[PDB]
Design a protein around this ligand. Structure first.
Ligand SMILES: CCOC(=O)CO/N=C(/c1ccccn1)C1(c2ccc3c(c2)nc(CNc2ccc(C(=N)N)cc2)n3C)CC1
Ligand SMILES: [Ca+2]
Length: 223
């Protein structure tokens, strides 16, 4: 997260860290046994780390659970990043409590202007690399489709939306991928891609979760 602030330990209880000997992507806990992340975060040997704040120190409240299976959307396209969404089933159910809780799926799509909270342990620098120990947060609005399409001509599909600041300076970045974009208590987006980080006229692009609620429910119900 570039230009954000320290969230504060366990203030984003649905935030998950995907780990394979190091943090590589974020995720959102949607129920005691399922996590939603980005398809481009797919990798074998995934350990889901819940209740984390400082990812480099065991401080208490952490739950490390192996993924029993990862389900990348069948229509995910690695070239266009269309349908960049993946479901991860935990080997065991997480212990839900004050510091580890699930986020609700939306019942309707969010409108332009809606303010949302984006979080993660990704790069905190626009020019260079600096990864934080603790979870960073950023409040950013959902941009209009016209502004989004004008920023990335021909690269925005109906399963994507832009959120952030055109003036640059505040944005999600590498390492934040797969993480949550929560608006009014509903998970509306998944950190997906962008051109650089926090660059002027190059806002972040996110997977439009509201287009996948039926798919998510049907898939979870059959696995
Ligand atoms: C770094 C090398 O990348 C390449 O060579 C190809 O990039 N190809 C594309 C592309 C996207 C959509 C449609 C067509 N082509 C891209 C692209 C595509 C996928 C990407 C990407 C950049 N960067 C990432 C890494 N994560 C990331 C980056 C920036 C973010 C942001 N600004 N909010 C949020 C997350 N991922 C994941 C240049 C914009
Ligand atoms: Ca920790």
């Amino acid at each position: 997260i570039v230009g954000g602030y320290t969230c504060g330990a366990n203030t984003v209880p649905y935030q998950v860290s995907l780990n394979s000997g190091y943090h590589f992507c974020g995720g959102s806990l949607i129920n005691s046994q399922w996590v939603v992340s980005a398809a481009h975060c797919y990798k074998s040997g995934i350990q889901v780390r819940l209740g984390e704040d400082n990812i480099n120190v065991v401080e208490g409240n952490e739950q490390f659970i192996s993924a029993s299976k990862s389900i990348v959307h069948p229509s995910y396209n690695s070239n266009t990043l269309n349908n960049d969404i993946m479901l991860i089933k935990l080997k065991s159910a997480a212990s839900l409590n004050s510091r580890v809780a699930s986020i609700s799926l939306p019942t309707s799509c969010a409108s332009a202007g809606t303010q949302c909270l984006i979080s993660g342990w990704g790069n905190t620098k626009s020019s260079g690399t600096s990864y934080p120990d603790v979870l960073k947060c950023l409040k950013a609005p959902i941009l209009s489709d016209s502004s989004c399409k004008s920023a990335y001509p021909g690269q925005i599909t109906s399963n994507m939306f832009c959120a952030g600041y055109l003036e640059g300076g505040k944005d999600s970045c590498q390492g934040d991928s797969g993480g949550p974009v929560v608006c009014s208590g509903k998970l509306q987006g998944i950190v997906s891609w962008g051109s650089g980080c926090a660059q002027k006229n190059k806002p972040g692009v996110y997977t439009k979760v509201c287009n996948y609620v039926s798919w998510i429910k049907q898939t979870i119900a059959s696995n």
